[PDB]
């Protein structure tokens, strides 16, 4: 039942199939406590965000 002709309905912008794909291919760690301060000090502007 592989190649059945089928049009697709749902528009895959739920961001969650994307997330489950990143946990599948790579071993995603968390952020360091100093890199939080680094990326939050340098992004005080709203346009840069």
């Amino acid at each position: 039942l592989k190649g059945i002709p089928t049009l697709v309905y749902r528009r895959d912008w739920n961001y969650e199939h994307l997330f489950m794909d990143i946990k599948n291919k790579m071993a995603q760690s968390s952020l360091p406590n100093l890199a939080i301060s680094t990326i939050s000090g340098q992004l005080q502007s709203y346009s840069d965000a």
Partner: protein, 137 residues
């Protein structure tokens, strides 16, 4: 590096919203009006009792990812009935992937937050974050 991206993403996502908090703007504007109501005094007193001993730096991050990924607006009451507790939906969302700090929200979060007041809990958490990182330093 690329093993941080999603967490990096959600951090910056929450960061954008908290910038919306400090410039005094209407900060969601697209989600449904049913969730955008005020807490009563008892719920926000129990919330403050939670937040006095709380890992805010992960709490408001996970809450903001869940709201802007799940509470999208039209057809969002499918699995997210606005009369449940936040503790049950957060632990049910968070046994799939995450291995974080779970006993604090198991033994300390209030049992009767009444879901329809969802984002005002986030507003109180982020303004407590801002009072800590601005009034102190």
């Amino acid at each position: 590096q690329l093993r941080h991206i999603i967490a990096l993403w959600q951090f910056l996502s929450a960061h954008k919203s908290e910038q919306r908090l400090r410039l005094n703007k209407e900060l969601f504007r697209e989600i449904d009006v049913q969730y955008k109501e005020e807490l009563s005094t008892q719920h926000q007193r129990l919330l403050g009792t939670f937040l006095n001993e709380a890992g805010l730096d992960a709490f408001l991050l996970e809450l903001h990812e869940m709201i802007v990924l799940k509470l999208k607006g039209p057809r969002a009451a499918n699995s997210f009935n606005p009369n449940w507790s936040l503790k049950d939906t957060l632990v049910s969302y968070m046994e799939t992937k995450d291995s974080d700090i779970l006993s604090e929200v198991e033994s300390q979060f209030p049992e009767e937050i009444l879901m329809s007041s969802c984002i005002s809990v986030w507003k109180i958490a982020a303004t407590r974050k801002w009072d800590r990182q601005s009034r102190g330093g």
